[PDB]
Design a protein around this ligand. Structure first.
Ligand SMILES: *[C@@H]1O[C@H](CO)[C@@H](O[C@@H]2O[C@H](CO)[C@@H](O)[C@H](O)[C@H]2NC(C)=O)[C@H](O)[C@H]1NC(C)=O
Ligand SMILES: *[C@@H]1O[C@H](CO)[C@@H](O[C@@H]2O[C@H](CO)[C@@H](O)[C@H](O)[C@H]2NC(C)=O)[C@H](O)[C@H]1NC(C)=O
Ligand code: NAG
Ligand code: NAG
Lengths: 30, 30
């Protein structure tokens, strides 16, 4: 919701997405 | 849940899939 320029006290990190790792697992392994 | 023939007042639209375009993203990745 929104962006980083409105909230007070936001910090920097990375949010893990389960779709991409799962994707690589399917095609290469075959 | 269910289908369109039981509810009263249902309208027609399209429901966006976050996975449908992302499966095409998988196609690209391949
Ligand atoms: C969180 O990270 C962003 C970068 O993703 C930081 O944004 C930078 O802010 C400085 C100061 O205004 C700019 O000089 C940089 O150009 C910005 N980066 C980019 C990529 O534009 C942000 O300051 C970070 N916030 C904290 C609290 O560390
Ligand atoms: C919502 O859309 C569906 C089609 O997806 C409509 O169903 C049609 O209904 C008429 C009237 O009974 C039929 O002649 C058509 O054959 C139906 N379409 C299909 C593809 O079978 C439905 O009427 C729409 N509802 C509203 C409220 O607009
Ligand atoms: C929290 O308080 C410190 C002072 O202890 C201040 O430097 C900092 O900017 C404050 N952060 C926020 C989000 O208010
Ligand atoms: C809502 O009311 C209108 C009359 O103003 C009627 O034509 C319509 O069929 C009604 N719809 C439902 C879902 O009851």
């Amino acid at each position: 919701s929104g962006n980083c320029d409105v909230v007070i006290g936001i910090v920097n990190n990375t949010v893990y997405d389960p779709l991409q790792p799962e994707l690589d697992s399917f095609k290469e392994e075959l």
